[PDB]
């Protein structure tokens, strides 16, 4: 219920890694099978 | 007539159905014909009259 805590000029490493993981997970779209199929299509084109 | 035709063009911009667009594109293509070659049609009319009278 309390409003917030203001930030710092010198961020701690926990906010840095949390923001980096949020950026990494905020853009993930595909699953394992779609990623595997894209990688296999790239490998098949390379082999051809 | 020009102002009422352009007003009808503005009123007909929204997609109503496919026959309306068909009429619009046909009118546009007939406009892009230009003037017909009436002298040419005169020549094939005379030539067809000649060969049909020979026939």
């Amino acid at each position: 219920t309390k409003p917030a805590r203001p930030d710092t000029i010198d961020l701690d490493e926990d906010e840095k890694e949390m923001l980096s993981e949020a950026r990494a997970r905020l853009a993930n779209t595909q699953g394992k099978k779609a990623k595997r199929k894209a990688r296999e299509r790239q490998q098949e084109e390379s082999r051809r | 007539k020009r102002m009422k035709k352009k007003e009808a063009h503005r009123d007909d911009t929204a997609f109503r159905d496919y026959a309306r667009e068909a009429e619009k594109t046909y009118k546009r293509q007939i406009r892009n014909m230009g003037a017909p070659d009436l002298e040419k049609y005169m020549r094939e009319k005379l030539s067809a009259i000649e060969k049909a009278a020979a026939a």
């Binding site: 203001p6 710092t8 010198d10 950026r23 853009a27 | -």
Partner: protein
């Protein structure tokens, strides 16, 4: 330095770095 940062992070910021971090033939046989 525990003063508030001048550029406060928002969610659309996270969206902005989320967006940015995403032939001739010799013969007829290969034709």
């Amino acid at each position: 330095n525990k003063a508030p940062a001048p550029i406060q992070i928002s969610a659309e910021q996270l969206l902005r770095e989320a967006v940015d971090r995403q032939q001739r033939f010799a013969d007829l046989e290969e034709l």
